[PDB]
Design a protein around this motif. Sequence first.
Motif, mmCIF file in Angstrom:
data_model
loop_
_atom_site.group_PDB
_atom_site.id
_atom_site.type_symbol
_atom_site.label_atom_id
_atom_site.label_comp_id
_atom_site.label_asym_id
_atom_site.label_seq_id
_atom_site.Cartn_x
_atom_site.Cartn_y
_atom_site.Cartn_z
ATOM 1 N N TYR B 6 0.875 -1.160 0.000
ATOM 2 C CA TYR B 6 0.000 0.000 0.000
ATOM 3 C C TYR B 6 0.922 1.222 0.000
ATOM 4 N N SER B 7 0.676 2.119 -0.944
ATOM 5 C CA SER B 7 1.641 3.147 -1.301
ATOM 6 C C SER B 7 0.955 4.456 -1.610
ATOM 7 N N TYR B 8 1.721 5.540 -1.559
ATOM 8 C CA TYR B 8 1.305 6.829 -2.088
ATOM 9 C C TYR B 8 2.449 7.398 -2.936
ATOM 10 N N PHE B 9 2.122 7.913 -4.122
ATOM 11 C CA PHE B 9 3.152 8.337 -5.054
ATOM 12 C C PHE B 9 4.069 9.432 -4.503
ATOM 13 N N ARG B 10 3.549 10.302 -3.631
ATOM 14 C CA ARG B 10 4.323 11.434 -3.066
ATOM 15 C C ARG B 10 4.972 11.123 -1.700
ATOM 16 N N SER B 11 4.574 10.024 -1.061
ATOM 17 C CA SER B 11 5.158 9.644 0.234
ATOM 18 C C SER B 11 6.584 9.174 0.041
ATOM 19 N N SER B 12 7.531 9.915 0.599
ATOM 20 C CA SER B 12 8.929 9.534 0.491
ATOM 21 C C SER B 12 9.171 8.205 1.226
ATOM 22 N N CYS B 13 8.380 7.922 2.245
ATOM 23 C CA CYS B 13 8.482 6.642 2.921
ATOM 24 C C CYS B 13 8.121 5.482 2.004
ATOM 25 N N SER B 14 7.050 5.646 1.231
ATOM 26 C CA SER B 14 6.653 4.606 0.285
ATOM 27 C C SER B 14 7.738 4.356 -0.777
ATOM 28 N N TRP B 15 8.433 5.421 -1.190
ATOM 29 C CA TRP B 15 9.468 5.299 -2.207
ATOM 30 C C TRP B 15 10.611 4.432 -1.685
ATOM 31 N N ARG B 16 11.022 4.664 -0.433
ATOM 32 C CA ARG B 16 12.065 3.877 0.190
ATOM 33 C C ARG B 16 11.805 2.387 0.031
ATOM 34 N N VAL B 17 10.583 1.982 0.327
ATOM 35 C CA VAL B 17 10.237 0.577 0.303
ATOM 36 C C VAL B 17 10.188 0.091 -1.160
ATOM 37 N N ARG B 18 9.783 0.944 -2.094
ATOM 38 C CA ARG B 18 9.776 0.542 -3.486
ATOM 39 C C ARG B 18 11.216 0.335 -3.951
ATOM 40 N N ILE B 19 12.155 1.139 -3.459
ATOM 41 C CA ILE B 19 13.531 0.988 -3.910
ATOM 42 C C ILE B 19 14.020 -0.337 -3.409
ATOM 43 N N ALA B 20 13.752 -0.627 -2.135
ATOM 44 C CA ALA B 20 14.311 -1.825 -1.531
ATOM 45 C C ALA B 20 13.675 -3.099 -2.108
ATOM 46 N N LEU B 21 12.400 -3.025 -2.470
ATOM 47 C CA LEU B 21 11.724 -4.163 -3.045
ATOM 48 C C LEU B 21 12.350 -4.447 -4.399
ATOM 49 N N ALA B 22 12.523 -3.389 -5.182
ATOM 50 C CA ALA B 22 13.123 -3.480 -6.508
ATOM 51 C C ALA B 22 14.581 -3.933 -6.443
ATOM 52 N N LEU B 23 15.301 -3.489 -5.414
ATOM 53 C CA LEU B 23 16.721 -3.838 -5.270
ATOM 54 C C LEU B 23 16.897 -5.321 -5.055
ATOM 55 N N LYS B 24 16.073 -5.885 -4.174
ATOM 56 C CA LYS B 24 16.113 -7.303 -3.838
ATOM 57 C C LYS B 24 15.373 -8.203 -4.870
ATOM 58 N N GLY B 25 15.017 -7.627 -6.018
ATOM 59 C CA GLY B 25 14.327 -8.341 -7.081
ATOM 60 C C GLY B 25 12.959 -8.902 -6.717
ATOM 61 N N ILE B 26 12.281 -8.320 -5.732
ATOM 62 C CA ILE B 26 10.996 -8.841 -5.293
ATOM 63 C C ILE B 26 9.867 -8.234 -6.120
ATOM 64 N N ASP B 27 9.100 -9.094 -6.786
ATOM 65 C CA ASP B 27 7.924 -8.657 -7.530
ATOM 66 C C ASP B 27 6.797 -8.423 -6.545
ATOM 67 N N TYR B 28 6.104 -7.295 -6.670
ATOM 68 C CA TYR B 28 4.968 -6.993 -5.805
ATOM 69 C C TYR B 28 3.828 -6.300 -6.557
ATOM 70 N N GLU B 29 2.691 -6.186 -5.886
ATOM 71 C CA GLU B 29 1.488 -5.563 -6.433
ATOM 72 C C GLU B 29 1.282 -4.292 -5.648
ATOM 73 N N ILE B 30 1.006 -3.189 -6.332
ATOM 74 C CA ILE B 30 0.835 -1.896 -5.675
ATOM 75 C C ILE B 30 -0.663 -1.635 -5.531
ATOM 76 N N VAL B 31 -1.074 -1.293 -4.311
ATOM 77 C CA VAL B 31 -2.406 -0.743 -4.038
ATOM 78 C C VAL B 31 -2.229 0.692 -3.540
ATOM 79 N N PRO B 32 -2.379 1.675 -4.419
ATOM 80 C CA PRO B 32 -2.342 3.084 -4.010
ATOM 81 C C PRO B 32 -3.497 3.520 -3.119
ATOM 82 N N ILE B 33 -3.255 4.616 -2.404
ATOM 83 C CA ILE B 33 -4.049 5.031 -1.243
ATOM 84 C C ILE B 33 -4.449 6.500 -1.346
ATOM 85 N N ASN B 34 -5.574 6.864 -0.726
ATOM 86 C CA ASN B 34 -5.931 8.277 -0.502
ATOM 87 C C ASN B 34 -4.850 9.032 0.311
#
Lengths: 191, 198
Positions: B6-34
Motif C-alpha cells: 500500500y503506497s502513495y506516489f508522493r510519500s517519500s516513505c513509500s518510495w524507500r520501500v519501493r527501492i528496496a523491493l526493486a533492489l532485492k528483485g521482489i515482484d509486488y502488487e501496488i495498491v495506491p491510497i488516498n
Amino acid sequence: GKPILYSYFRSSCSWRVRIALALKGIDYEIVPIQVPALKIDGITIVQSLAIMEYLEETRPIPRLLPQDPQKRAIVRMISDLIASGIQPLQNLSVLKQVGQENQMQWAQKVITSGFNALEKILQSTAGKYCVGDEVSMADVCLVPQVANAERFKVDLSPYPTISHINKELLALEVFQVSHPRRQPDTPAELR
Amino acid sequence: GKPILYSYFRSSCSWRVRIALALKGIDYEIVPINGQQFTEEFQTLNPMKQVPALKIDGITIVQSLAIMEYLEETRPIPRLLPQDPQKRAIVRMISDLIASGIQPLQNENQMQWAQKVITSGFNALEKILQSTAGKYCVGDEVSMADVCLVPQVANAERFKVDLSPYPTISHINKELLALEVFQVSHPRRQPDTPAELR
C-alpha cells in the motif's frame, strides 16, 4: 577506556539508550548536556535506534529483538512508530518554536493520536510486554514515551494495555537505574 | 501469491520501500491510497491509515525502517547493511537521521519551516558524508542510507532547497538516480501519479 553516553535527563531518546545499556549489563560513563550520542568500540553513534541495533548485534543477550524475523518486524514497527512517529512531532525544537501553552495542546494531540494507534496494535501483539512475554526494543521505546505523556498531562485511562505494560516495565531494575530522576544532571527538586 | 504494498506516489516513505523491493528483485502488487474489504486489510496492524504498509509472508509490516530490515533479513542480497557491525551503525545512523529526524518534522510559511528542517539535517548529513562516503553514502556499495537519501533529496527540490551547499549529497544522489532500482520505483512512474507530474 569505557563507553561514554552524552545524555540529557529529560530527553526520552537518551533514556532509551540508558535502558538498553543497563539491560545489556554495559557499564558506561555519563557526560550530561545531538543527544543521545554514544562513544563505544572506538566509534561515535548518534540516533537511539542505530545505537540500540549496534548494542543488540555486539551484545546479543538480553535480546531486544526476538529470533523470528516476523516477530522482529512487529517489535521494530512499534519502536519506529514511537521514535519516528510520535516523539519527533513533540521534539524540543518544535515545542519552543510554537508558543509556551500551544506546545501542550499540540503535544497532546500527537501523543493521543499515536497512543490510539499503538493501543490497538498492542491488543494483538502484547502478552506481558509489547510483543509477547519477553522485553524488547518496543518496551525500551514505550516507557520514555509514556513518561512524556504523564508530563504533558495525558490521561492514560483510555490506554489500559499501554499502562499495564508500562507499569510491568517500570518494576524492573533496568528501567529504574536509568530513570530521568536518578541522573547526574537531574535537578535536585525532581527526585 | 506476491507481496502487496500500500503506497502513495508522493510519500517519500513509500518510495524507500519501493527501492528496496526493486533492489532485492521482489515482484509486488501496488495498491495506491488516498470498500471495507480493502479497508480492513489496509488497517490491520495499521489503525493509523499509514503508508507504506507491506503484506508479505502472511503478515503486515508498517514503518519503512522495519519493512527494510525485514527485507534485509529474509532476502539478504543485495545488502542494504554491510557485514561489519560498526559500518552497519553508520548506515543506520544516516538512515535514522533522515527517517526519524528530517522527514517526520515536515509531514504560507510552512515553507519556511520545511526549509529550516531540511537544511539543518543536510548540514549535519553533508558533514557526516565527508567522512563516510565513497561513491555512495557509506563506501562504494549502495546501502539503506542511499535508499533514504534519494526520496529526502527529492523533497528538498520540491520545497525549492538549493543543493549547492551540499555537493556530496548531490553527487551521491545523482549516482543513485542513474540506477534502474531508483528509476522504476520513482514517484513519477506510479499507478497513482496524476498525469500533471510527467
